[PDB]
Each structure stands twice: as C-alpha cells, then as structure tokens.
Amino acid sequence: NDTVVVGSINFTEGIIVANMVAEMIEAHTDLKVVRKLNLGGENVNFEAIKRGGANNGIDIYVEYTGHGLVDILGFPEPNVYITADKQKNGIKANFKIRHNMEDGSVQLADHYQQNTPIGDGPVLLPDNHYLSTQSVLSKDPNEKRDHMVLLEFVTAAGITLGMDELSKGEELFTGVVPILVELDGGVNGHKFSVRGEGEGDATNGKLTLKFICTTGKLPVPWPTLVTTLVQCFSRYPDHMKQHDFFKSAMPEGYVQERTISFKDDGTYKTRAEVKFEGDTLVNRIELKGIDFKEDGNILGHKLEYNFPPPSSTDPEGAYETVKKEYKRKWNIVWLKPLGFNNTYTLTVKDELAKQYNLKTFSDLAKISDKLILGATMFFLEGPDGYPGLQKLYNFKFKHTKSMDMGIRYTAIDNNEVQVIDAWATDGLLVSHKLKILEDDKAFFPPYYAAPIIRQDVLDKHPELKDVLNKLANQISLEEMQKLNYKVDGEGQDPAKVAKEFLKEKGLIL
Numbered sequence: 001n002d003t004v005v006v007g008s009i010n011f012t013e014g015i016i017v018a019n020m021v022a023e024m025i026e027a028h029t030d031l032k033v034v035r036k037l038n039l040g041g042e043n044v045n046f047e048a049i050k051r052g053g054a055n056n057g058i059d060i061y062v063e064y065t066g067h068g069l070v071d072i073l074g075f076p077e078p079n080v081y082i083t084a085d086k087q088k089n090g091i092k093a094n095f096k097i098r099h100n101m102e103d104g105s106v107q108l109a110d111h112y113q114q115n116t117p118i119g120d121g122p123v124l125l126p127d128n129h130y131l132s133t134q135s136v137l138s139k140d141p142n143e144k145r146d147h148m149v150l151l152e153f154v155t156a157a158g159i160t161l162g163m164d165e166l167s168k169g170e171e172l173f174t175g176v177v178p179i180l181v182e183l184d185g186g187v188n189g190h191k192f193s194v195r196g197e198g199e200g201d202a203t204n205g206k207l208t209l210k211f212i213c214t215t216g217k218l219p220v221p222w223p224t225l226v227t228t229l230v231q232c233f234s235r236y237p238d239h240m241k242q243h244d245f246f247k248s249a250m251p252e253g254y255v256q257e258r259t260i261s262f263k264d265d266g267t268y269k270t271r272a273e274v275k276f277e278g279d280t281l282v283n284r285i286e287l288k289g290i291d292f293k294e295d296g297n298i299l300g301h302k303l304e305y306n307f308p309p310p311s312s313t314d315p316e317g318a319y320e321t322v323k324k325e326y327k328r329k330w331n332i333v334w335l336k337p338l339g340f341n342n343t344y345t346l347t348v349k350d351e352l353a354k355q356y357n358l359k360t361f362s363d364l365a366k367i368s369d370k371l372i373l374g375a376t377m378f379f380l381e382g383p384d385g386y387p388g389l390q391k392l393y394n395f396k397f398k399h400t401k402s403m404d405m406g407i408r409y410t411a412i413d414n415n416e417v418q419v420i421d422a423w424a425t426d427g428l429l430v431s432h433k434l435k436i437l438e439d440d441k442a443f444f445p446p447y448y449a450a451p452i453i454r455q456d457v458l459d460k461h462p463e464l465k466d467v468l469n470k471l472a473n474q475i476s477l478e479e480m481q482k483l484n485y486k487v488d489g490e491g492q493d494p495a496k497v498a499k500e501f502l503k504e505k506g507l508i509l
C-alpha cells in the first residue's frame with residue numbers, strides 16, 4: 001500500500017514534469033512511487049485519475065488550466081460565438097450547454113441561433129466575437145409557486161483595441177431597464193406558460209429576473225429554459241461598441257429563433273420577439289419541444305438546479321475555476337502552479353512575417369489561403385486548438401497535416417509548411433528564427449501547469465500536499481525552455497535533467 005501511481009501523457013514536457021514529481025515524492029517522503037506513461041487517447045489522464053491507482057489508473061499527474069477547462073467545462077463550447085449573416089441582415093450564433101446531473105453525468109444541449117431585426121432600419125452587423133455568460137440560479141424561500149430566481153452577467157469579448165481607434169438604440173440601455181418575459185411552450189404535449197419579471201443593467205451586463213410557471217408545475221427542468229428566457233443587456237466594451245447587433249435593433253426589436261438539440265433526447269424549437277413596449281423590454285417566446293423521452297433526463301427531471309460556472313480567460317480566475325470544479329465534481333485536488341504558461345501559438349518564419357507584415361492571428365488569417373498549417377495531433381483534434389480557433393478567427397488554410405512533435409520545426413525550416421503550432425516551452429522557437437503571433441481575439445485560455453492529485457490518496461498519506469508544493473512557482477518558462485531543449489535538442493534522457501534541476505534549486509538534495 002506504500003506505493004503510489006504518477007501518470008503522464010507522451011510528450012517531452014509531461015514526461016519531464018512527471019519524473020520531477022516522482023523525484024520529489026521519493027526525496028521528501030519515504031513513499032514508493034510508480035511512473036505510468038499512458039499514450040494517445042482523448043483526455044486520457046482525466047479518465048485514468050477517475051479510476052485511480054487501484055483500477056490500473058493514475059493518482060497524480062500534471063495538467064494545464066486550459067486543458068482542465070476543456071475537461072470539466074468543455075472550454076470553447078459554453079462561449080456564445082456570434083458571426084454575421086448578411087443574407088437575413090442579422091446574426092447567427094452557436095454554443096453548447098452542459099447541464100449537470102445527479103450522478104456526475106452531463107446532459108448536452110446544442111444551441112444554433114438566428115437573429116433578424118424586426119424593423120427595416122440600419123443595424124450593426126458585427127465581426128466574429130463571443131458572449132461570455134455567468135448564470136446563477138436560486139430560489140425564493142417564500143414563493144410557493146414553481147419558480148426560478150435568475151441572476152446573469154454577460155460580457156462581450158473576442159475583439160482587440162489596437163491603440164489606433166476611438167449607436168441610436170444603445171441610448172435606451174444607459175440606465176436600468178425593466179424586463180418582462182412571457183414564454184408559451186409545449187413539450188411532448190405538455191402545455192405550459194412561464195412569466196418572468198425583472199430588470200437589466202447593460203452598462204454592467206447584469207440581469208436580475210424572477211420566473212414563475214403560471215400553469216402549475218413546470219414539465220421540464222428550469223436550467224433547460226435559461227438560454228431560451230435578452231442578449232441586448234450584454235455589456236459590450238467601448239472598443240467593440242460598434243459590434244452590438246442587439247441594441248442597434250432597438251426599439252423595434254429583433255426575432256431570435258433557436259434550435260436546441262438535447263443529446264440522445266428531444267429538441268426545443270423556439271421563436272421569440274425581443275422588443276420595447278412602453279419603457280419595458282419584453283421577450284415573447286413560443287417554444288415547441290418534440291421527440292423527448294418520457295423517462296428521459298428532461299421529462300424525468302434528472303438535472304441539478306444549477307448552472308456550470310463560466311470558463312474564464314484570466315489566469316488566476318481560470319486556475320481557481322478549474323480547482324473548484326475538480327474538487328466539487330470528481331473530488332480531485334489541484335496543487336500550486338509551477339509558474340510557466342505553455343500555450344499554443346501559431347508561429348511562422350520571421351522572414352515570412354517580415355515579408356507580409358504579420359503581427360497577429362488576424363493578419364495571418366487574411367492570407368491563410370496561400371499557407372499550409374503543420375500542427376500536432378493535440379492541436380488538430382483538441383477543441384481548444386484549431387477547431388476552436390476557426391469558430392472565432394475564420395482561418396482558411398490550404399492544407400493541414402498532422403505531424404509528430406519535432407518534425408514540424410524541421411518542416412517549417414525547409415518551407416514544407418508555413419505556420420506551425422509551436423508550444424511556448426519548446427526551446428526551438430529562438431533557434432529556428434521563428435516568430436510567435438499575437439492572439440489578438442484572446443481565444444486561447446491560460447495553460448499554466450500544475451500537479452493534480454486524488455483526494456483519497458491525499459488522505460491516505462497527508463504529507464503529499466506540502467511535498468508537492470515545493471515546486472510551486474519554481475520553474476519559469478525560460479527555465480523550462482532550457483530543460484525542454486536539453487531533451488529535444490540534445491539526446492539527454494528526461495529524468496537526468498529533472499534530477500539536475502532539483503539539485504540546483506536545493507529540493508532533491
């Protein structure tokens with residue numbers, strides 16, 4: 001029982017950090033340590049550590065906060081990605097909601113959305129951006145009716161202020177606006193009505209609403225109706241205020257049509273008119289749900305009364321969100337960060353960048369048709385990589401070829417490929433005369449690495465927390481770059497560099 005399991009993915013950095021963790025545990029404790037190295041897969045560690053060292057899994061492994069968000073929250077999907085549809089003079093939007101269940105499961109809700117101005121006046125057709133939403137569901141203790149108290153914060157992002165620059169409907173949201181919401185719905189023949197009253201502050205992006213089921217008991221769980229039940233109250237920062245389509249349609253309003261597909265269950269089809277009446281912003285919705293299962297998760301009320309927390313783009317917020325959602329669900333402890341952010345970045349030959357005056361990803365996308373992308377498997381398959389990039393940046397590459405790590409640097413050196421997915425810790429970025437490009441639309445989450453341990457393993461031997469926090473903020477990105485290079489440039493074995501570093505900083509000896 002004295003032994004423990006430490007897992008790792010198969011890439012240069014992960015093996016090194018796993019050997020570092022093992023050396024720490026064997027030095028500052030008298031514990032036996034195993035070094036498991038799982039390969040391939042899709043989010044493999046997560047499953048291995050869900051199993052544990054007893055079920056031939058893992059107990060401790062190093063994870064990055066962005067991939068953690070992808071694990072627990074499915075990072076790119078909860079963001080409401082908005083693009084412009086010039087045909088219908090409006091906008092289109094895509095996202096997914098992950099409804100928690102009692103048995104740790106997740107019910108998927110795929111949202112496709114169209115918005116079309118009701119009036120015939122001019123409206124703002126925006127560039128690709130996204131809405132980040134935080135939703136808090138609660139109850140009134142004194143309300144005997146079936147209800148939901150909802151409090152929302154919506155902020156727009158995905159557009160940069162480049163220190164180079166400076167509507168009629170917006171003037172209607174300067175103060176606090178009353179909000180009426182009326183939803184007439186039918187799901188599998190169940191007819192119901194929901195009436196919600198509240199207020200909205202668009203300058204802060206805050207919504208405070210109370211919804212009541214005026215027809216008795218609601219035949220569906222409340223969180224499935226949260227998206228359906230006022231995107232004009234989103235806080236748009238000044239530097240992208242000319243991209244708020246919703247406020248520009250006011251006071252005439254807009255039609256919001258939505259198709260919500262529940263995985264392995266029925267679907268909602270909703271049409272709403274969001275418009276001003278007197279001084280009140282009203283949202284009138286007709287909802288028709290069909291093909292639902294009577295004992296399913298929706299018609300069986302198998303969804304918890306909560307909402308997944310928002311996947312933040314701020315490093316501190318990202319770390320804390322991932323730590324909280326790992327501890328709450330699946331009972332997994334995030335330890336202190338090692339102090340280096342190994343993020344994806346689209347790097348080019350700096351000669352090419354000088355030739356085409358490429359500074360940011362947006363500059364790269366406008367000429368992406370002439371270029372070839374050589375990316376790793378994890379960047380072409382992971383939703384936090386190229387597929388998630390494309391729903392914000394509109395990259396149109398001529399070719400995309402998955403390549404083993406290290407092959408991509410020697411391939412961009414010989415112009416077999418123009419753009420590669422360089423990881424910031426690869427020491428090869430300086431030695432190949434390359435250039436990282438600015439992720440101006442801020443799609444990528446923070447990828448600060450930190451170790452991860454199970455709670456029961458932390459309980460059987462309680463000293464592991466302190467012995468693994470010896471590495472907290474000890475490895476800078478440039479330090480890790482030198483060591484990664486020692487493994488990738490020179491032929492040195494991974495464990496040797498780990499022992500050397502821990503001797504150098506006075507940890508292993």
Ligand SMILES: c1cnc2cc3c(cc2n1)[C@@H]1CNC[C@H]3C1
Binds near residue numbers: 382
């Ligand atoms: C799936 C699971 N974990 C990953 C960790 C990393 C990557 C891709 C992954 N894909 C690289 C990008 N950021 C941290 C490293 C390296």
